[PDB]
Write an enzyme that holds these catalytic residues in place. Structure first.
Site, mmCIF file in Angstrom:
data_model
loop_
_atom_site.group_PDB
_atom_site.id
_atom_site.type_symbol
_atom_site.label_atom_id
_atom_site.label_comp_id
_atom_site.label_asym_id
_atom_site.label_seq_id
_atom_site.Cartn_x
_atom_site.Cartn_y
_atom_site.Cartn_z
ATOM 1 N N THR A 37 0.894 -1.359 0.021
ATOM 2 C CA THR A 37 -0.067 0.081 -0.029
ATOM 3 C C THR A 37 0.922 1.229 0.083
ATOM 4 O O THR A 37 1.921 1.432 0.989
ATOM 5 C CB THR A 37 -0.956 -0.033 1.233
ATOM 6 O OG1 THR A 37 -1.635 -1.147 1.210
ATOM 7 C CG2 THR A 37 -1.763 1.324 1.178
ATOM 8 N N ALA B 24 -9.256 -1.648 5.406
ATOM 9 C CA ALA B 24 -10.013 -1.651 4.242
ATOM 10 C C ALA B 24 -11.364 -1.122 4.401
ATOM 11 O O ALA B 24 -11.759 -0.035 3.932
ATOM 12 C CB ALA B 24 -10.000 -2.938 3.520
#
Lengths: 239, 204, 230, 213, 248, 201, 199, 228, 238
Positions: free
Chosen positions: F1, F49
């Protein structure tokens, strides 16, 4: 003629107890207010001091935030609570959202506070009517008013108190389509409008102005005496 | 421990017609001092004081809650408070926080409001009162203060020798402690007047 | 139209229902309290309807603490409520301060209890006035409360039926100081002033406050005072 | 002491077609080193255009299925229409997040037709994050199925191979072949293969046997 | 009529229950306070001085409330003891929070918000109590305030409230001093005012009460002065009366 | 990420990768990590998430009501502050959230950073993620306030490429948004394997 | 970790902090401000956890402004300091405690200047100088060496520069820039920013 | 009998809600017309003062970006119902990623139009017109303080209600267009108001399928007036 | 008339008038007719227009896949009991995983409407429910009342001037158990036309028909599928 409950409709559809609260406004002191080009102004009609008391505790014009003002009528018991409540809300808004409080947000709070306070029995409605003035929302001068029914509403010039009808009819023939610039001219408008007071003693006026960037400026009874002199001087020249 | 987080020492001692109370001056976190003017002795009326030691949070907190309850007491009654009545008042305040307790151990010293009779007592951190006739001590350096007071105390002492006894007790016991020091203040009160002296101590 | 509720005023004066509750105090049994130099004497009037009633079942002179006694004139069943209230309230002082509650301090608090039933709007006030006595810190005390919530301090007073005769009697009959015994002789003489029948050891009931504590008298003690009582 | 979770196995596959969607799963229900039953399909016909699969802890799969079927009726009497495929996926994410601090141990895949008549597959996680994909494989044998479908459907790592879209008949034999290879190497997979096909004409079902060991 | 709870409004339109409460203050005792440099005072009237009472408190109208403020009282005794127990409990709550005494105005507004709130919520009786205020602070020094059953207040330099307190204000304006405001000038003015209101001849010291508040070396002492020294204050006024008619 | 955001003369640039893992297993390669809140606000997804997906959707529910009541768009400093207060009530309960708030305002460009710990700060350049520290080197060497528009597109596209090279938890495509005064605009979305041939020559 | 300093004068209070807002290796912001104008003569410095600094100190910030608008006059620095201590100690024995370290700087018209010290366990102290953080250890003995109670404001800035250069020498963290205020009878005046050419 | 909502008549009825319908009758008039090209909408302002700022008087508010509104009767009751109706569409989008239909908006609104004595207050004093373009095309609805929700093709409420409805049934038919129905509307308005109709007495609002923006007319309204 | 104010106050004759007045509120709504065969339970209602161009207000509304109800009386208490009705049906689906028996659902309604008929502070529910259903023992037609006396019946008609429908049903109730789905419906809507003044006719736009069957889910028809039912009728016998 049932006028003894607040949750009852008349057979022609009225709420007389809401209507009776607005009669209590008409026994209050008058206060007017206009918005200018940059400087807003409001004035009150101050009653006579009874010669044996201090006069710093008869405050009728207050500020909620550093950039918004307040003038009311009615009775001072119910007025003190609404002022003290609205100082909290304009402060708590700044905490939850980091902006300064717009003049439109704080009038919706006062109206909604007076709104939900009308509906239940055993809650006698607030018999005051407020004027909220502030050149706060990014250089834009605004003034609103409230109503004991709980309806906030926007004007460009205003009058409340005893015999406001004379003043409101006076302003429509006086508030020119010429936007009065040169802000001492705008103050000369209000002092002339309050010169059509119920008594017009001349020494019984308190005007409060705001030049949209400073704090509140309470005028002094020598500068206000100067503006009353030039109004009579210019009126003598018109003949 | 939590009692050893800031240190402190409070001592009271009974005289003939007078009573004396003393404490240190050091405020500090565990090893680093901060200041040398931390108040630990609080006046509760005339000829009646109180001393607090332990966690410096609860020292300032209890002294404000006790002052809250005292002024309401002395207005519903025109009289001032008796020394036994204050001891029962403090033990009520500590026992309400039975399972969330304040980390302090008070010491009360004072005279009778009507007669001249002295009074000393001390309490636990949950409010077990304990009156004596010679001395009470509290703080981190407790055992050093017992060794001095068992040897130097005499039964009937003038305010001169009472001052010299509690001075020699506090100076020698605190210099043996690590987390207490930086000056010692002494209140010696009596029927006629109140004398407050500060002593010349080791500032190390 | 104002005499039916409590939470509203009359256009001129005061509350109507509290004044009607004071009329119930005037229709009660007579009672006398006299503050002497060293003690306080309470005395009341206890006549049963028939011969059948036992006199040793219900008492009038009633202790609150070991040095605090209390009588009334009004309605008996409302009296038992605020007695049990004043008992439990006296202990709450003692749990905090470890000291017997002074007599000025209860009457601060008992009147605040009788205060609370004068609120809105579906409760009735008490119909009982009180006379409270005690010997705290040498000097004795004699107080009187009422269903409104006020409280005072008498040298001597009387309440119940025919109290105005007893007021005019004790107005002529008080001095600054007598002993505790001479206060008893003049407290029975004023109860005898308005009485119907032969006053025996069971028609009256007397309790006193020494500085050595509160106690109410046995019938033998009350007989021997009433024997050769003037 | 008492632990509130247990693993039951299962494998769920979904493929979004051009005008169809295929959802398949095995019917084995296991626990530890035991077989509870050989007949327990994970497919659930929600509407006539939406099939959901539920894997993981089986006690939460029975609960979560009954919560969804209640809220379908609550939508319909309040809005006079059935939910879309995308509306169910938006609703389910709120339901899964509603027990954020005591989560459902359920992997979810919703396959079905959109409002335009094309396939749509929404994958999930046990806390409620979702996205629209073309194909996902969830459950115990999920790592054995994703690299093969990237080769055949996605045409990844292939040189000079044209991209013909997947027909219906070609997609059937891809689903039947990936579970045969998965049943050889995974122990939580076998005993049957229930396949559901969503088209514009209804929902067809089909069962193909697997190895029984 | 409009004889119901405090809610509602009358038509035309006002509040009759508040008017019945505020008018009923005229049946109470009598209390007043005066202008003073370096001080302030209160004076009050003993009612019902029948000889079978004790005065075990020796302070009935006056309640020393914080440490440097006191107040008089006029109205229903039942409501009087509720407010005085409340008002002392306001000031200690402020002191717990800031470790500084309450500055003598926001104490008053704290009570007047409570006294107001029974006029809006039903169904409560409004407080039938009016009372004064004396005090000293850091910001303005010596002060006077005037409570009302409505919840309204005002800061005065000399006022009076109670039984016949409609003509006593006229003597205050007739004897208004400014600049010269010493305590002996102020105490001598007070005994003359109560002489006009009270029709009891010769003005017995058992019928009055005088409490003062001065400022001494940072202590703000409060004096409820006893009956022995009222006597030199009364006979001084009796002396000045006989001397003043020598011009006729 | 790996996400990054910087503001310059001509607005704000937002760029991010698209790889989401689960342990050592790659879940997907097509994750949209830049959440389109409004036509005038953009938020990122960095750490957690469903946590970043839920609370920013709840923020988008909130700013629309503010616009309907006050007849005016919300400011960027206000929308950053509302998200900071909602998360702070769940402090210590185990939320993961490290997003950024981007948007044009009446005061100009706006760039705020929001943690799940309650670190509401403003700034000029930020980079959040597991491969975030690989982006701070290549971006700050090339950053200027007076960059061109096409130059700033090449800077952010290079910086994500160097982050996905060294880091293992970053890959997929490279998304790129541009915040203009009127509203945001999607620029492009390039695969790393296509950028590898371009950058190697 | 980060740094505060509290030099008190005869008629002024000199305060300074650092401008660093780091995240676990990197330094995200190098012009961060830790100074909160409570009123026209009162500052507030806050050092603590990641969220508790902004949440708590703004709660005190807006609550003192309410006292000004409602009463018409300003709090003393003594009462304003002693209101903050009441709010930590009440919120300490709860599920949500605040972990911040404060120091307060005020000027009074009646009492002159004032400086207060605050722990995360809510203990007050009245100090002639104070510091927080790990840099408080190295620097306050320098400030203990050259302090004079009758010191001028020009010497105090010079003594502040001595106090900061040794933190540039033997302290492992970077800390390049330092913002400085001053409070006197007029109000809060901002002095120039202090930075460091190292080599 | 009436004097309270917890009471029946011998015949029906209320006698309290009947009085609430009477409170609508002294409001300002408002006309909306449903047409297949879209829903137009019109209202009369009734401005009192020239000092009175005109845009603070709201009669059309925007509930959502595809649903308009129009009110009469008590303003104080109206601002509560407008506040919830914005939230109810907003929560529905939050949990379904879609737009709430125009019919199911008013279901959520009517669910506390009828709560006035149904707890464990008075009924409201406001009638509403809701126009919008959902997936079934353009829609127009109408409610009342009794919560009676209904669909109307062209409705007119407030004062001059019966005088409008009689004239409005004359000109309406199924095959209208949007530009036809706007000028068909304000012909009725100048017949039923008292002032000479200008650009300051009225205001408009139209919603179209492809034009979810701009439920308003801003001084193009001056052009429509001269097209009378 | 002094006893005619509250639900609590009994009369000196034993008749509480407030319950007697809520019966009159049912007669304000339009008429509706329910009936059943051995296999099919059909309820047919009559719409009423508000104006000439407004839509007609609906009467029959779906509850569950085997239960649908009609309505007469206040629309406030209509949706208030409907939301209680739908909640209880899906709870038996959630807990017991079966549909409710229709008979014990109605006993929950009588317990629901009982409490506001005895405690002060809440009016009775003025409402006129007709219920059709399928438990395991076939079709059912139920009616309720604001006095909470629920009745099992084989044919019923309530609302305004609904007596003329009842007199039709008594002389044809023997014919109802044997006919099929088709004329059972037009046995029922021959009964509504006597609840009409003789100058207007039962058209398509003003009538609704709901059918639940033994193998048929509860289905509401309106305005377009009524035309296969309206064919095959005679005119009114004038």
């Amino acid at each position: 003629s049932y006028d003894r409950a607040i949750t009852v409709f008349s057979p022609d559809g009225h709420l007389f107890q809401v209507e009776y609260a607005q009669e209590a406004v008409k026994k209050g002191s008058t206060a007017v207010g206009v918005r200018g080009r940059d400087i807003v102004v409001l004035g009150v009609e101050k009653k006579s001091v009874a010669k044996l008391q201090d006069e710093r505790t008869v405050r009728k014009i207050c500020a909620l935030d550093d950039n918004v003002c307040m003038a009311f009528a009615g009775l001072t018991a119910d007025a003190r609570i609404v002022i003290n409540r609205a100082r909290v809300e304009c402060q708590s808004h700044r905490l939850t959202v980091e902006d300064p409080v717009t003049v439109e947000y704080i009038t919706r709070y006062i109206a909604s506070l007076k709104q939900r306070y009308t509906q239940s029995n055993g809650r006698r409605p607030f018999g005051i009517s407020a004027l909220i003035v502030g050149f706060d929302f990014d250089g834009t001068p605004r003034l609103y008013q409230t109503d004991p029914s709980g309806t906030y509403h926007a004007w460009k010039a205003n009058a409340i108190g005893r015999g406001a009808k004379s003043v409101r009819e006076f302003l429509e023939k006086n508030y020119t389509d010429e936007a009065i610039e040169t802000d001492d001219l705008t103050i000369k408008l209000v002092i002339k409008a309050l010169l059509e007071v119920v008594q017009s003693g001349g020494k019984n006026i308190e005007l409060a102005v705001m030049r949209r960037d400073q704090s509140l400026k309470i005028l002094n009874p020598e500068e206000i005496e100067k503006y009353v002199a030039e109004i009579e001087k210019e009126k003598e020249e018109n003949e | 421990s939590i009692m050893s987080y800031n240190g402190g020492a409070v001592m009271a001692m009974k005289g003939k017609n007078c009573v004396a109370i003393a404490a240190d001056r050091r405020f500090g976190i565990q090893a680093q001092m901060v200041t040398t003017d931390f108040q630990k002795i609080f006046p509760m009326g005339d000829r009646l004081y109180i001393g607090l030691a332990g966690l410096a949070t609860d020292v300032q907190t209890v002294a404000q809650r006790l002052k809250f309850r005292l002024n309401l007491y002395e207005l519903k009654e025109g009289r001032q408070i008796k020394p036994y009545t204050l001891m029962s008042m403090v033990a009520n305040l500590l026992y309400e926080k039975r399972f969330g307790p304040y980390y302090t151990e008070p010491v009360i010293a004072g005279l009778d409001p009507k007669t001249f009779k002295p009074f000393i007592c001390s309490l636990d951190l949950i409010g077990c009162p304990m009156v004596t006739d010679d001395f009470v001590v509290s703080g981190t350096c407790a055992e050093q203060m017992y060794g001095m007071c068992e040897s130097l105390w005499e039964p009937n002492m003038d305010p001169d020798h009472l001052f010299e006894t509690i001075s020699q007790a506090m100076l020698n016991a605190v210099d043996r402690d690590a987390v207490s020091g930086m000056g010692v203040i002494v209140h010696i009160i009596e029927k006629d007047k109140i004398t407050t002296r500060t002593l010349k101590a080791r500032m190390d | 139209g104002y005499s039916f509720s409590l939470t509203t005023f009359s256009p001129s004066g005061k509350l109507v229902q509290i004044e009607y509750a004071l009329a119930a105090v005037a229709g009660g049994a007579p009672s006398v309290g006299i503050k002497a130099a060293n003690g306080v004497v309470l005395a009341t009037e206890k006549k049963q309807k028939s011969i059948l009633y036992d006199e040793r079942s219900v008492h009038k002179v009633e202790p609150i603490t070991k040095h605090i006694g209390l009588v009334y004139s009004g309605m008996g069943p409302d009296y038992r409520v605020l007695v049990h209230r004043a008992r439990k309230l006296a202990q709450q002082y003692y749990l905090v301060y470890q000291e017997p509650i002074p007599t000025a301090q209860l009457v601060q608090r008992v009147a605040s209890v009788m205060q609370e039933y004068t609120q809105s709007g579906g409760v009735r006030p008490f119909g009982v006035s009180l006379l409270i006595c005690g010997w705290n810190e040498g000097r004795p005390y004699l107080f009187q409360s009422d269903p409104s919530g006020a409280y005072f301090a008498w040298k001597a007073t009387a309440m119940g039926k025919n109290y105005v005769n007893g007021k005019t009697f004790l107005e002529k009959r008080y001095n600054e100081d007598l002993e505790l015994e001479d206060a008893i002789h003049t407290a029975i003489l004023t109860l005898k002033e308005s009485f119907e029948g032969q006053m025996t050891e069971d028609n009256i009931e007397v309790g006193i406050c020494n500085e050595a504590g509160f106690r109410r008298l046995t019938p033998t003690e009350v007989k021997d005072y009433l024997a050769a009582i003037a | 002491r008492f632990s509130p979770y247990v693993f039951n196995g299962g494998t769920i596959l979904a493929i979004a077609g051009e005008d169809f969607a295929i959802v398949a799963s095995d019917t084995r229900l296991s626990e530890g080193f035991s077989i509870h039953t050989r007949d327990s399909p994970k497919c659930y016909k929600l509407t006539d255009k939406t099939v959901i699969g539920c894997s993981g802890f089986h006690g939460d799969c029975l609960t979560l299925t009954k919560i969804i079927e209640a809220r379908l009726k609550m939508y319909k009497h309040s809005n006079n229409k059935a939910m879309t495929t995308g509306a169910i996926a938006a609703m389910l994410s709120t339901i899964l997040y509603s027990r954020r601090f005591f989560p459902y141990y359920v992997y979810n895949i919703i396959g079905g037709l959109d409002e335009e008549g094309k396939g749509a597959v929404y994958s999930f996680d046990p806390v409620g994050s979702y996205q629209r994909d073309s194909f996902k494989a969830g459950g115990s044998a999920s790592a054995m199925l994703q690299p093969l479908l990237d080769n055949q459907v996605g045409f990844k790592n292939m040189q000079n191979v044209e991209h013909v879209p997947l027909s219906l008949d070609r997609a059937m034999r891809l689903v039947k072949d990936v579970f045969i290879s998965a049943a050889e190497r995974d122990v939580y997979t076998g005993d049957a293969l229930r396949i559901c096909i969503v088209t514009k004409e209804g929902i067809r079902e089909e069962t193909v046997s697997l190895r029984k060991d | 009529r409009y004889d119901s709870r405090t809610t509602i409004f009358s038509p035309e339109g006002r509040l009759y229950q508040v008017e019945y409460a505020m008018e009923a203050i005229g049946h109470a005792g009598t209390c007043l306070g005066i202008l003073a440099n370096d001080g302030v005072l209160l004076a009050a009237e003993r009612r019902n001085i029948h000889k079978l009472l004790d005065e075990v408190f020796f302070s009935e109208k006056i309640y020393k409330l914080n440490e440097d403020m006191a107040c008089s009282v006029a109205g229903i005794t039942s409501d009087a003891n509720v407010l005085t127990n409340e008002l002392r409990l306001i000031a200690q709550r402020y002191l717990l929070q800031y470790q500084e005494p309450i500055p003598c105005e926001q104490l008053v507004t704290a009570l007047c918000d409570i006294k107001q709130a029974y006029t809006q919520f039903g169904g409560k009786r409004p407080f039938g109590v009016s009372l004064l205020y004396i005090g000293w602070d850091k910001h303005y020094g010596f002060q006077l305030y005037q409570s009302d059953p409505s919840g309204n207040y005002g800061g005065w330099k000399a006022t009076c409230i109670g039984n016949n307190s409609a003509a006593a204000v006229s003597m205050l304006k007739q004897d208004y001093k400014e600049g010269e405001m010493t305590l002996k000038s102020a105490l001598a003015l007070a005994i003359k005012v109560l002489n006009k209101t009270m029709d009891v001849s010769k003005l017995s010291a058992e019928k009055v009460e005088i409490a003062t508040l001065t400022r001494e070396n940072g202590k703000t002492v409060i004096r409820v002065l006893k009956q022995k020294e009222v006597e030199q204050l009364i006979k001084k006024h009796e002396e000045e009366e006989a001397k003043a008619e020598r011009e006729k | 990420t790996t996400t990054l955001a910087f503001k310059f003369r001509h607005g704000v640039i937002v760029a991010a990768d698209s790889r989401a893992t689960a342990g050592a297993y790659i879940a997907s390669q097509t994750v949209k990590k830049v959440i389109e809140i409004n036509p005038y606000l953009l938020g990122t997804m960095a750490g957690g998430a469903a946590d970043c997906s839920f609370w920013e959707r709840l923020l988008a529910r909130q700013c629309r009501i503010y616009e309907l009541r006050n007849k005016e768009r919300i400011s960027v400093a206000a929308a950053s502050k509302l998200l900071a207060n909602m998360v702070y009530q769940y402090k210590g309960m185990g939320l993961s959230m490290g997003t950024m708030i981007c948007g044009w305002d009446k005061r100009g460009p706006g760039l705020y950073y929001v943690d799940s710990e309650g670190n509401r700060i403003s700034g000029a350049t930020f980079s959040v993620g597991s491969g975030s520290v690989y982006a701070y080197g290549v971006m700050d060497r090339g950053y200027s306030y007076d960059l061109e528009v096409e130059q700033a597109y090449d800077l952010a596209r290079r910086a994500i490429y160097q982050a996905t090279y060294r880091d293992a938890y970053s890959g997929g495509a490279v998304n790129l948004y541009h915040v203009r005064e009127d509203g945001w605009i999607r620029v492009s979305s390039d695969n790393v394997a296509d950028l590898h041939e371009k950058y190697s020559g | 970790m980060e740094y505060l300093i509290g030099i008190q004068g005869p008629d002024y209070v000199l305060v300074a902090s650092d401008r660093v807002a780091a995240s676990n290796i990197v330094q995200m912001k190098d012009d961060h401000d830790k100074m909160f104008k409570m009123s026209e003569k009162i500052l507030l410095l806050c050092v603590g956890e990641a969220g508790d600094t902004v949440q708590f100190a703004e709660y005190i910030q807006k609550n003192v402004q309410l006292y000004k608008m409602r009463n018409g006059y300003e709090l003393s620095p003594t009462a304003a300091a002693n209101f903050t201590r009441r709010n930590l100690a009440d919120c300490l024995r709860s599920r949500t405690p605040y972990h911040v370290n404060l120091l307060l700087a005020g000027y009074d018209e009646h009492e002159g200047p004032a400086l207060y010290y605050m722990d995360y366990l809510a203990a007050l102290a009245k100090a002639p100088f104070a510091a927080h953080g790990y840099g408080a250890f190295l620097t306050l003995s320098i400030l203990d060496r050259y302090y004079t109670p009758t010191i001028s404001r020009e010497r105090a800035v010079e003594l502040l520069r001595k106090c900061l250069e040794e933190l540039q020498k033997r302290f492992i963290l970077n800390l390049p820039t330092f913002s400085v205020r001053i409070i006197d009878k007029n109000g809060i005046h901002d002095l120039d920013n202090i930075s460091f050419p190292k080599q | 009998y009436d004097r309270g909502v917890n009471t029946f008549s011998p015949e029906g009825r209320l006698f309290q809600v009947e009085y609430a319908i009477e409170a609508i009758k002294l409001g300002s008039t408002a006309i909306g017309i449903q047409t297949s090209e879209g829903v137009c909408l019109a209202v009369e302002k009734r401005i009192t003062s020239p000092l009175m700022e005109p845009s603070s008087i709201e009669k059309i508010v925007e509930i959502d970006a595809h649903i308009g509104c129009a009110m009469s009767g008590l303003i104080a009751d109206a601002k509560t119902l407008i506040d919830k109706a914005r939230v109810e569409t907003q929560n529905h989008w939050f949990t379904y990623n879609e737009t709430m239909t125009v019919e199911s908006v008013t279901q959520a609104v009517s669910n506390l139009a009828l709560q006035f004595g149904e707890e464990d207050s008075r009924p409201f004093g406001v009638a509403l017109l809701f126009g919008g373009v959902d997936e079934k095309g353009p829609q127009l609805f109408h409610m009342d303080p009794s919560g009676t929700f209904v669909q109307c093709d062209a409705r007119a409420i407030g004062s001059a209600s019966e005088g409008a409805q009689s004239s409005l049934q004359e000109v309406y038919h199924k095959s209208m267009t949007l530009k036809e129905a706007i000028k068909s509307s304000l012909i009725i308005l100048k017949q039923v108001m008292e002032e000479k109709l200008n650009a300051t007495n009225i205001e408009l609002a139209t919603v179209q399928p492809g034009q979810n923006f701009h439920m308003f007319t801003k001084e193009e309204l001056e052009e429509v007036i001269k097209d009378i | 008339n002094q006893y005619d104010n509250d639900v609590t106050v009994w009369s000196p004759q034993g008749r509480i008038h407030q319950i007697e007045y809520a019966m009159e509120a049912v007669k304000q709504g339009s008429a509706t007719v329910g009936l059943k065969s051995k296999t099919h339970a059909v309820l047919v209602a009559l719409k009423r227009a508000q104006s000439e161009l407004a839509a007609h207000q609906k009467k029959i509304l779906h509850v569950d896949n085997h239960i649908g109800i009609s309505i007469a009386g206040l629309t406030a208490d209509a949706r208030l009991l409907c939301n209680f009705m739908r909640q209880e049906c899906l709870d038996s689906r959630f807990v017991f995983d079966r549909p409710l028996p229709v008979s014990r659902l109605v006993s929950l309604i009588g317990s629901k409407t009982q409490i506001p008929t005895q405690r002060y502070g809440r009016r009775p529910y003025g409402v006129g429910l007709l219920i059709a259903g399928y438990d395991d023992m076939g079709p059912h037609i139920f009616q309720t009342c604001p006095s909470a006396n629920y009745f099992d019946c084989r044919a019923m008609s309530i609302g305004a001037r609904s007596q003329s429908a009842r007199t039709y049903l008594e002389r044809h109730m023997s014919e109802f158990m044997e006919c099929n789905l088709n004329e059972l419906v037009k046995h029922g809507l021959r009964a509504l036309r006597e609840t009409l003044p003789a100058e207007q006719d039962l058209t398509t736009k003003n009538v609704s028909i709901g059918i639940v069957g033994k193998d048929l889910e509860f289905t509401i028809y309106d305005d377009d599928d009524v035309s296969p039912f309206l064919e095959g009728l005679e005119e009114r016998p004038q």
